[PDB]
Amino acid sequence: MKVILKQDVSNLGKRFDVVDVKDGYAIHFLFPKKLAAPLTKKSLQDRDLFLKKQQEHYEINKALSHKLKEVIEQTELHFSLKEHNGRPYGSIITKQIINQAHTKGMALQKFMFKDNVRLGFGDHEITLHIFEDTTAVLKVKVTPDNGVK
């Protein structure tokens, strides 16, 4: 069925387009990740009329995403010290969402589908790298420090 997509995806389309994709990748992957949107104004001719507003809507959500990027870039003070043996036992046990226990609400939201961090989420006692992707062009670099309480 017909689906319009938001961001840039390796297959199918680029920014605006109409793709006939199976609901499995659409209703479970493209939609929760904000990579696509359902029938605009509930039809096709309705979609054509509303595209003259969809362009500016895409511009402003990208614009607020740039605003979101500045807010994380102005602080870089997300701090966490672990409680462990320390000398022979060093590993971050915060998983990933404990760090989001310091982003959403307190500071920039930084949703679970937005931060494209690896599956190791940092396992070091020193400065590390956090990568977050607001859009398909912006890359976010965060440097959190670690240690012993």
Partner 1 sequence: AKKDQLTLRGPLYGNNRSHSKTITRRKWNVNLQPCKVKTADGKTTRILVSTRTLRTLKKHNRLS
User: Which residues contact RNA by CB under 7 A?
Assistant: 11, 21-22, 24-25, 28-29, 32, 41, 95-97, 101, 104-106, 112, 119
Task: Show contacts with partner 1 in window 35-74 (CB under 8 A).
Answer: 38-39, 42
Nearer to RNA, 108 or 140 (CB): 108
Residues with their C more than 2.5 Å from the N of the next written residue in the chain, i.e. before a break, are: none
Q: Which residues pair with 132 in a beta bridge?
A: 140
* Residue 95 identity (one-letter amino acid): K
How far apart CA 92 and CA 59 sit, in angstroms, is 38
Task: Show contacts with partner 1 in window 18-37 (CB under 8 A).
Answer: 23, 27, 31-32
Closest CA to 92 of 131, 41, 129: 129
Count of residues that interact with partner 1, criterion CB under 8 A: 7
Binding interface with partner 1 (CB under 8 A): 23, 27, 31-32, 38-39, 42
